[PDB]
């Protein structure tokens, strides 16, 4: 028969079959375990007197936290490790390259109690 009929003047790259990967050997032989578990997200209580005050007055736990951890990973790692409801989490980087979480609990939980339940005092 006769020719194609292109109504447009631009030639464009033909839409060709783009095939997914079926590797013949694995990537790295073992998937790396969870790089930031809860026990790595929160590293130490901060028991400075100005912090211990926030426990007694403002119902807040102060934690030294992994630099790699964000506000979400703190809130989750607090609930799992301490069985508490977290209202909100404020963080700041201490002037020695460490992360400080100001973790505030909902009114159900008394921070002071949960503070000498973990042990520090």
């Amino acid at each position: 028969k006769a020719l194609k009929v292109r109504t447009s003047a631009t030639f464009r790259l033909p839409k060709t079959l783009k095939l997914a990967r079926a590797p013949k050997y694995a990537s790295k032989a073992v998937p790396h375990y969870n790089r930031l578990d809860s026990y790595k997200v929160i590293e130490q209580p901060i028991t400075s007197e100005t912090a211990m005050k926030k426990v007694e007055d403002g119902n807040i736990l102060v934690f030294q936290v992994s630099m790699k951890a964000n506000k979400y990973q703190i809130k989750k790692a607090v609930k799992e490790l301490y069985e508490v409801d977290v209202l909100k989490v404020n963080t700041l980087v201490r002037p020695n390259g460490t992360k400080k979480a100001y973790v505030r609990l909902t009114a159900d939980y008394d921070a002071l109690d949960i503070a000498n339940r973990i042990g520090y005092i």
Binding site: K4, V5, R6, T7, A9, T10, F11
Partner: protein, 233 residues
């Protein structure tokens, strides 16, 4: 006739945006497309010398079809046919004491360039087919001259892959015949005679004729009408 209505459109300059048309003549093709097309044109605007362009004189489809007709009766062995022939001749020879001849003398088309060349030299070919496509044409150009000096009847045939299909290769520069069972001797000389008439006799005359120098029709019509009016005014 109902609430429907005829409302013809006015595609004249300055109104009614042009409709979609077949711009196939105008598309901006990829360079690889552009190159091969202009390669064919540049190969036609030049004056091509007669030792080339004795090609482009391709054998006609009918004579060719009868040549593919005969040549197919002489394909080489297939994959299974040779392994089948071996065990048939590995058994009957090694025990039945066949003189390495538990198999009949084969008859097939000869192929491969260097193979076919020495066949012509040694005056063993009876009919040589040459493809018209060979891209380093030097692989082939000297064959019409060679066959002519060796009394070997040759034919330039459209299709380097079509010569390849009949020999189980994707392509094949040449295909020739030397052996033919007596049942097909008569059809051969019949084809050879038509073939010699088209090529091997026209050789010396074609050898004197250049080709090409053929204008595109924009410069052709500008020529057919410029010499039309200038002379017959």
């Amino acid at each position: 006739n109902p609430l429907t209505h005829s409302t013809p459109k006015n595609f004249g300059i300055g109104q009614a945006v042009q409709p979609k048309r077949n711009l196939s003549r105008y598309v901006k093709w990829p360079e690889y497309v552009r190159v091969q097309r202009q390669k064919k044109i540049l190969s036609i605007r030049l004056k091509v010398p007669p030792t080339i362009a004795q090609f482009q004189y391709t054998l006609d489809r009918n004579t060719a079809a009868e040549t593919f007709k005969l040549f197919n009766k002489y394909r080489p062995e297939t994959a299974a046919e040779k392994k089948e022939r071996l065990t048939k001749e590995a058994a009957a020879v090694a025990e039945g004491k066949s003189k390495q001849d538990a198999s009949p003398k084969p008859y097939a088309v000869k192929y491969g360039l260097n193979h076919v060349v020495a066949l012509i030299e040694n005056k063993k070919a009876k009919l040589v087919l040459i493809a018209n496509d060979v891209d380093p044409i030097e692989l082939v150009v000297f064959l019409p001259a060679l066959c002519k000096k060796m009394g070997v009847p040759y034919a330039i045939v459209k299709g380097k892959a079509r010569l390849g299909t009949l020999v189980n290769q994707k392509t094949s520069a040449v295909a020739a015949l030397t052996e033919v069972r007596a049942e097909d001797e008569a059809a051969l000389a019949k084809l050879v005679s038509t073939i010699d008439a088209n090529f091997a006799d026209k050789y010396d005359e074609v050898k004197k004729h250049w080709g090409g120098g053929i204008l595109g029709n924009k410069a052709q019509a500008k020529m057919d009408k410029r010499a039309k009016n200038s002379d017959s005014a």
